[PDB]
Amino acid sequence: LDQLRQEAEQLKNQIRDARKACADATLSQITNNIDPVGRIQMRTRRTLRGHLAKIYAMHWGTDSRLLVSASQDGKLIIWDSYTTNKVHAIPLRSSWVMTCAYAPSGNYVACGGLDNICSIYNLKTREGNVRVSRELAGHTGYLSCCRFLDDNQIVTSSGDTTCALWDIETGQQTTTFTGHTGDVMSLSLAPDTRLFVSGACDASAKLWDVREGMCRQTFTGHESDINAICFFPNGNAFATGSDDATCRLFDLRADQELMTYSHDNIICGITSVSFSKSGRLLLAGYDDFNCNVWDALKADRAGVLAGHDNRVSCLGVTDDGMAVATGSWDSFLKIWN
Amino acid sequence: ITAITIMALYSIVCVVGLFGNFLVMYVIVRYTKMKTATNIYIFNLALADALATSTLPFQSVNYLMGTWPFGTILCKIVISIDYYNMFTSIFTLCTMSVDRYIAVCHPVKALDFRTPRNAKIINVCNWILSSAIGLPVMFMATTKYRQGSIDCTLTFSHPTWYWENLLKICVFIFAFIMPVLIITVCYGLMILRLKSVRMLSGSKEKDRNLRRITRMVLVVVAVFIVCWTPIHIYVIIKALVTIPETTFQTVSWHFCIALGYTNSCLNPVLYAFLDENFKRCFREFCI
Amino acid sequence: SIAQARKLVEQLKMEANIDRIKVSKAAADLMAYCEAHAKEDPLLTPVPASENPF
Amino acid sequence: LSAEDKAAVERSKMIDRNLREDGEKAAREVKLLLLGAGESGKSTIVKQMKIIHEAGYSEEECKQYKAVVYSNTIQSIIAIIRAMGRLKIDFGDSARADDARQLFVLAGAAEEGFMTAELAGVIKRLWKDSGVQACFNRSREYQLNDSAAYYLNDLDRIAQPNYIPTQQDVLRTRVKTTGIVETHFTFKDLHFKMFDVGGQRSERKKWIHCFEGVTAIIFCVALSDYDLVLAEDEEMNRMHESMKLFDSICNNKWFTDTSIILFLNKKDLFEEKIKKSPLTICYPEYAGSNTYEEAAAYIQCQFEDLNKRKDTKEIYTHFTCATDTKNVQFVFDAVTDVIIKNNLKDCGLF
C-alpha cells in the first residue's frame, strides 16, 4: 500500500546509479580537440509575410520548398518559400490552433489546438479546393503537437498528459501512450519512424515505441516545463528546450544527458528546437526575440538569428538542410541560409 | 562687432548637427531592425540635413574673414547644395504626408506600397526632380572679385525683369504654396478620419507604435513649418515690398537665416527625443 | 489508486533492465556522425550565391 | 520577368486579398472571454447569449436535451440518496430503503436517462420523504448539483412520456464539455465572439497567453459558494479559490489592456442562503449583519480589493441570475455600453 513508494525510490536509485556507472566521460571533455565553428551568421533571404496574428507552429516539407504555418487568426497558410507565394490558405473551424504538420508525402496537412480535434485536410482533392477529410477526436485537452507518420497514421500529443497514435481512415485511436504526470507540449518523430519522444510539463521527456505502444526510457534533468523536442538526425539522441532557459542533449543509448546549452543573462524559455542536416548546429528559438545557434558538441553560441519583433515560437530545418525557417508572434516567417 | 564672438556658436551647432546626422546614418545600416519606409525616409532627410550642415563652416569662413579664397567650383557647390536641402526637405516631408495618408486613411491596401523598393524609387526620383530644378544654379554660379566686397551670388542671363524675380516667385510657390497645402489638407483628412468615428478593437500594441510614429511625423512637419516660414516671407517682402534698409532689419535677417538652418540639427534630437528604437542604442553606446 | 501506484513501479521495472553503453562511446559516435555528414550541411559551409535557391 | 509562373502569383494575390478581407472583418469585432471557477454559470451565459441574440432554441435543439435533463435529474437524486450514507440520516419511512435499492437497480444503465413510469414513481416517492428533504436542506456538507431542487420539484411534468424541455429546462442543464466553446452573435451593430474554456482539463498557464488581446474578460463568480466546502482537504473554500483565481487573471501580464467584467452570478440563491447560512463561514473577519445587501457588497469589495491595478484599470461588477433572460439581457446591455464607451475612449488624436 504505502510500501510501493519506498521501492519505487530504490528503482529510481537503481536507474540513477546505472546511469552514473556508464558516465566515465562526457561530451564536452572529448570535443576539446575538434575545431570550433567560429561565428555562423545567416541573413534573412526571404520574409514570408501575410499573417495577421501570432504564428504558433510551422512545418517544412520533404521537398524542402513548401511549408505550412498556422496562426491565431484561424489560417493555415501553405506557402512556397522559393518564390514567397501563398499556395493555400485553409480556414479553420476553430481559430484556436497550437500545432500544424505537413505530411511527408505532401498530400495532407494536420492542424489542432484548443478545440481538442486534430483536423487532417486533404491537399490533393482532385476536384477542387482544399477541404477537411478527417476530424480525429478523443482527446480531453489541448492538442500541443502532431507529426505525420504516413498518409494513414498520425502521432499526436495533448494536454490531458497523453499521446496517441491514430489511424486516419477508421478515425480511431489505434494506440494511446500514457505515463506523463504533466501536459505534453511537443513530440518529435525518429528518422526511422519507429520511435518518438515527447516532453511534458513534469520536466521529463519520455521515449515511446509506436509499433508496440509502451514507454522505454524516461529522461529527466530539466527544472521546468519542456516546450520543445527534436531528434538528432541519426535517430540516437534528441535535444529538449525548457522554460528554465536551458537546452539539453539526451542520448538514447547512454540513457542520460550528455550536454547542457545555456548562457548567463538568458532567462527566457525555449519555444522551439531543431537540428541541422548533420546535427552539428543546434537551433533554439527563444522568447527574447532571438534564435540562438549553438554548437551541439562544444556547447557554445555559434550564431544568433535576430530580426523578429515578437517571440520566436517555431523552428524548421529543411530535409536537405539548406535553410532555417523561424516563425514568430509578430506574424512573420523568416528564411535563413 | 558681430563676427568674432559669433563663429563659436555656429561651429558648435554645425558639429552637433553633423554628429547627430552621422549617428542617424550609422543606426540604419546593417541592422536587423530599422527597415521600414518611414525610417528610410528619415534616413534621406538626415542625409540631406548632413549635406546642409557640412557646408556651414565653408559658408561661415566668408563671414568670419570677409574674403572667399575657396574657389570657383567651391562656391558652385555651396549655393547648389543650399537649394538642395530647401527643396528636398519639404518634398521628403511631402512624401511622408502621402505615406501616412495611404496608411491610416486608406484601407489594408497600405500593404501594397509599403515595400521598401517603391520607397527607394520615390526617394531617388524625388532627388532627380530636385537636381533637375537645381541645375540652373549649378549653371549660373560664379565668384566676382568686386572692389567693394567678394561675392558669389546667383547671376542671370538676359535679366531685364524676367529672370531676377521669377526665380524667387517660382521657388516660393513651389516650396510653401504647393507642398504645405497638400500636407495641411492631408492632416485635415487624417484628423477627420481618425476623429469622426470610433476605432476598432484591434491590435493596440501594434497600433500605439503607429500612433506614436504619426505624432512624431506631425511634430517634425510643424517644427519645419514654424522654422522655415519667416525666412521665406522675409524673402518675399524683400523682393516685392522692398522696404528701406535698417539695423534691426539686418539683425532680423541674420537671426532668421540661423533659424532656417537650425532645422538640420533640431530634427535628429527631435525624432530621437521620444522613440524606443534609438534610445536603447544610445544608452548602450553612451556607456 | 493501487493500480496507478503499481503502474509506475512496473514501468520502472521494465526501464532499469535495459542495456546502457558508455557515454564516451555514444558521444564518439555522435561526433563521428557530425564529421561524416558535415560536407552536406549547407549551414556549416554556406555557399554565398551559387546553389542556394534563396 | 516574363515567366510562366504568373498563375501562381495571381493565385497568391487572390489568397492575400481574401485574407486581408477576413482580417478586416476580424479586427471589427468584440471578443469576450468567459472565465471563472467550476459551476459558476459560464455555459448558462453562453446559452443565454444564444437565446437573446439568435432564434433561441428550435424543436430539435430542445428535444436533443431531454436525455441530458433525465441524466442530470438521475445524478442529482443519486447524489442526494448517497449523501445519507456519509451524513447518517434516518429515512422518514421504512419503504424508502427499498425505494433507494430499486432506484439503484433501475439506474444500472449508464448510457442515457430513461425515466420510465417505474422510475418516475420511485423518484416521486423518494422526493416526498422528510429525511430526503432534510438531506437536501443540508446540501452544504457535501457536493450536489445546483439545479437539483428545480429539476426534482417539477418531476411530474419532466417525467411525462411526451415531455419537451422548455427554455429554462435547457438553460438549467448541467452538461460537461471538453473543447473550447465559442459562440457567434451580433448586437449594437457589433459582432461578438464569445469563448469558454471551462471544460479544459489542462494547465491554465499553457494557453492563457492565447487570449491576449481580447476585448473583455467576463469573470463569472457564483455567490452561493461561500457556504460550500471542497472535499479534498476540508480546509479550503470555493469562494477563496475563485478569489485567488480572480487574483491571478486580473493581475495577469497578458490582460493589461482588457476590460474585466465581474459577473456575481447566482444572486437568487444567495438571497435565500444568506438568511440561514452566515457569511462568516467563508470570511471569518466579517463583522457586518447577515443581510443580502451588505453581504453582496462585501463580496464585491473583497473581489475588487484582489486587484492590484485599481489606479489604471477598473473592474465592472454586476450581479446576475444567469437563468433569468431579462436580468442577463440588462446586464449584457450595460456591459456592451461600457465596452462601446471604452472603445470611444480608445479613439483619440495624436
Ligand SMILES: Nc1nc2c(ncn2[C@@H]2O[C@H](COP(=O)(O)OP(O)(O)=S)[C@@H](O)[C@H]2O)c(=O)[nH]1
Ligand atoms: N438557481 C440557479 N442556478 C444557476 C444559475 N446560474 C447557473 N445556474 C446553474 O449552475 C449550474 C452550473 O452552471 P454551468 O453549467 O454554466 O457551469 P460552468 O460552465 O461555469 S463549469 C447549472 O446547472 C446552472 O443551471 C442561477 O442564477 N440560479
Ligand SMILES: C=CCN1CC[C@]23c4c5ccc(O)c4O[C@H]2C(=O)CC[C@@]3(O)[C@H]1C5
Ligand atoms: C535659411 C537659409 C536658406 N537660404 C537659401 C538661399 C536663399 C533663399 C531662401 C528662400 C528662397 C530663395 O529663392 C533663396 O535664395 C537665397 C536668397 O535669396 C536669400 C535667402 C536664402 O539665403 C535662404 C532662403
